[PDB]
Design a protein around this ligand. Structure first.
Ligand code: I3P
Length: 292
């Protein structure tokens, strides 16, 4: 009741996760390339248990609930609210999950959701009328720290996205600018496990990255929002300060982390193209035409 956990499929050696694909939310078992299945820990695999009176599972990263509906005949899905009876499951002990509403048991499949992708990693999950034996889940407890971290990252992501949208449309208030400035500094402190504050350049020599947090920055769309912020002015001193901090968060988010380096370099390339390579030349001509 209130506990946060990961649901690890024993036979498949994959965690039950929920993420967006093709601009849609999907529930699935995630294939990992790691040589240690239990090390493939994603914030998108965190579920908060709710005691009905038997159980409901709330996807912490999106607030939606685990459910099942006709697509084995049914398939696990994500739903906006936890009111329907379709989001209620029964645990039968390692535990097997029975979907009350349909009286079916959670069963894994090899049907990938990300077809187009080379070597897909999203495997659909359904329910079978028969109670299998190799379709059990290990309930993996999640540490309070990881939960607190997700809560902060989730809030940060919303603030950055919000402020970014406003900045795209023009400008922001003094408080919003002050808030985003403080948040970016907090993000530096956060991702470097407190080794850097982001207040000066000299301290960079002692920065040490917290890998799980760097990963969180990417997964919870913090990095995505940062680029949105960087792009906004192309679509004073405090503004430059905000941009400097944006690049600082990017720096520590990719520090000694190959996956984030490629992700960030890719997003930077996209932003550059989206902005246009001639935006400054065109702007200078326009300014001169208006005698400036
Ligand atoms: O070999 P490297 O350079 O360490 O890179 C890791 C490798 O690609 C893992 O397979 C991947 O896990 P998944 O296959 O489960 O994605 C992990 O992602 P993560 O950092 O997002 O866990 C990468 O960081």
């Amino acid at each position: 009741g209130g506990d946060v956990v990961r649901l690890f499929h024993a036979e498949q050696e994959k965690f039950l996760t929920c993420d967006e694909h093709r601009k849609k939310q999907h529930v699935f078992l995630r294939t990992t390339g790691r040589q240690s299945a239990t090390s493939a820990t994603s914030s998108k695999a965190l579920w908060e248990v709710e005691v009905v009176q038997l159980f409901r599972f709330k996807h912490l990263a999106t607030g939606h609930y685990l459910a099942a509906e006709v697509d084995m005949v049914y398939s696990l899905v994500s739903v906006p609210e936890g009111n329907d009876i379709s989001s209620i499951f029964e645990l039968d002990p390692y535990v097997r999950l029975r979907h009350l509403c349909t009286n079916t048991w959670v069963h894994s499949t090899n049907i990938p959701i990300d077809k187009e992708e080379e070597k897909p990693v999203m495997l659909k999950i359904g329910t079978s009328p028969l109670k299998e034996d190799k379709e059990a889940f290990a309930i993996v407890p999640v540490s309070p720290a990881e939960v607190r971290d997700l809560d902060f990252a989730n809030d940060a992501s919303k603030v950055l996205g919000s402020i970014a949208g406003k900045l795209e449309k023009g400008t922001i208030t003094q408080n919003e600018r002050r808030s985003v400035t403080k948040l970016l500094e907090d993000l530096v402190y956060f991702v470097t496990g407190g080794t850097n504050s982001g207040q000066d350049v000299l301290e960079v020599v002692f920065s040490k990255p917290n890998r799980e947090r760097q990963k969180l920055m990417r997964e919870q769309n913090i990095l995505k929002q940062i680029f949105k912020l960087l792009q906004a002015p192309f679509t004073h001193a405090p503004f430059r300060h905000i941009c400097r901090l944006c690049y600082r968060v990017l720096r520590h988010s990719q520090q000694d982390y190959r996956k984030n380096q490629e992700y960030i370099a890719k997003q930077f390339g996209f932003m550059q193209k989206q902005i246009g390579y001639d935006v400054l030349a065109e702007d200078t001509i326009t300014a001169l035409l208006h005698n400036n």
